[PDB]
């Protein structure tokens, strides 16, 4: 198919400016208010795979979240890594950088 691009419009929020968790569609770059409304409406979290700035332990439902991240929340330079740490929660790829973990 070529495609019909119409039903993507507000469907993907994608990621603009905070931490989107991977199980709400609400963001917030505080990541006080982040971790308050996860720790109040998903305290615990287990699923199968998912990526997780370990720079700012926060899940979202898109890779991508994790890659433009260094680019506008992290900026500097682009270079993550992944490993795979994830406990108390599911075990999820948590992406680090080499550098702008400062
Ligand atoms: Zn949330
Ligand atoms: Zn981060």
Known sequence: ??????????????????????????QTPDLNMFTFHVDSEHPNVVLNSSYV????????????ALSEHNLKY????????????????????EQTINDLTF
């Open 1 to 26: 198919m070529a495609h019909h691009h119409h039903h993507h419009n507000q469907q993907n929020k994608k990621v603009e400016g905070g931490y989107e968790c991977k199980y709400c569609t609400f």
């Open 53 to 64: 700035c370990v720079e700012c332990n926060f899940l979202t439902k898109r890779y991508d």
């Open 74 to 93: 992290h900026p500097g330079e682009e270079n993550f890594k992944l490993t795979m740490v994830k406990r108390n929660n599911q075990t999820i790829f």
